[PDB]
Amino acid sequence: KEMKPFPQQVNYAGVIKPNHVTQESLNASVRSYYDNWKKKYLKNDLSSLPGGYYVKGEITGDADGFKPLGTSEGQGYGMIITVLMAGYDSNAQKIYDGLFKTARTFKSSQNPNLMGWVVADSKKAQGHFDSATDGDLDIAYSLLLAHKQWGSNGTVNYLKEAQDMITKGIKASNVTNNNQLNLGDWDSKSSLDTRPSDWMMSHLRAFYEFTGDKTWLTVINNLYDVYTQFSNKYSPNTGLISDFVVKNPPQPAPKDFLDESEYTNAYYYNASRVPLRIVMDYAMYGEKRSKVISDKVSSWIQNKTNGNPSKIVDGYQLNGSNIGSYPTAVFVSPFIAASITSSNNQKWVNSGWDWMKNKRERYFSDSYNLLTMLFITGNWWKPVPDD
């Protein structure tokens, strides 16, 4: 009953795939990576929610006295991965519906159309936590994929669930009056605080195509404006953006923003995800502003590393100075993805593929590496409202 079974192995206009191996090799690498990811991270052991699934994060410490097991961010990653692997994993729909059960049971304490950001094995946690924008973005987008994979005439009306989450959830709570995306449903409607890894341009395009609400296009265009307004001043040579961005005109967040890290003003663990989220817009929708941003970052990192992906480190100041020390896939793999819009990057893309295809480390890097591998092999297909 899959209408888009793995592997869809699509060919987006103007983008290259790794070409030193066959497509069957690329698909086999993705299948193996998924089987290992699923074994290590996909869980269905919530005593407080039989039938609920989640993705096991690490997460040090407690969250409001609860022991955090996963987040809405990982829930969204897992839900996208699961729908895309349908046709290989015969339990994909059961897993997806179980992830959705968790997402709606652990609803946000603020906007109940969203997911609260922490999964913990307690009925008290179900409805206790507020939302985080990126988790709900990936969850809502995954519902569009589910609609196109299985149709919406079964137990879960995926399209209606998507439309409600997009409109009553994300637009209502996270689209700001300044046409940005705020940090979560606890943040204000007039907030100028934003996390650029939430600027999931290609998801926002799909939201527009499946709701017809032009708000999404207004946000896309404005966020491209913001990216350029920020980078021309703060990263004119590298093209990078910081983990968090504040104020108008946009500027790097201060250090220790939200107590996340000393490097919230820099290209750190949140922003490492940006180059994938941006490049997908060029690949799936032909957006030239995405190619411009992607080529600038790709050229910078290739020169920085002398064409060696293993020389990428886990964090950079906006001027390109090293913060990190070692190559991890949440940084490496999006830099490879950013490189796919120019054919003269072929060798670099091939080297990046060899680096990432078997690279297993921990939840955050592995989950984002799998999303990136799905995308760069053509196996993340585009949901379209019909034929």
Q: What is the DSSP string of 31-73?
A: HHHHHHHHHHHEE---TTSTT--EE-----S-BTTB---EEHH
CB 32 within 8 A of CB 181: no
Residue 118 lies in a domain: yes
Domain that holds residue 366: 21-377
Per-residue tokens: 71 = 């987040």
The domain tally of the chain equals 1
Is 6 contained in some domain? no
Residue with tokens 């089987």: 35
Token digits for 365? 């890097």
13 within domain boundaries: no
Cβ neighbours of 322 (radius 10 Å)? 13
**252 DSSP 8-state letter:** E
Structure letter (DSSP) for residue 166? I
CA angle at 16 for the pair 15 and 22, rounded to the nearest 5°: 145
* Whole-Å CA distances, 66 to 69, 112, 123: 9, 20, 11
Does residue 50 lie within any of the structural domains? yes
**Is 73 an annotated catalytic residue?**
yes
The answer as to whether 4 is a domain residue is no
- The reply to whether 2 falls in a domain is no
Distance of alpha carbon 87 from alpha carbon 65, whole angstroms: 40
Amino acid at 246: V
Closest residue by Cα to residue 134 from 386, 368, 376, 381? 368
Q: Does a structural domain hold residue 47?
A: yes
Catalytic residue among 97, 130, 134, 366: 134
Could you tell me if residue 199 is inside a domain?
yes
Judge contact between 179 and 222, C-beta under 8 A.
Answer: yes
Candidates 73, 89, 198, 314; catalytic one: 73
134 is annotated as an active-site residue:
yes
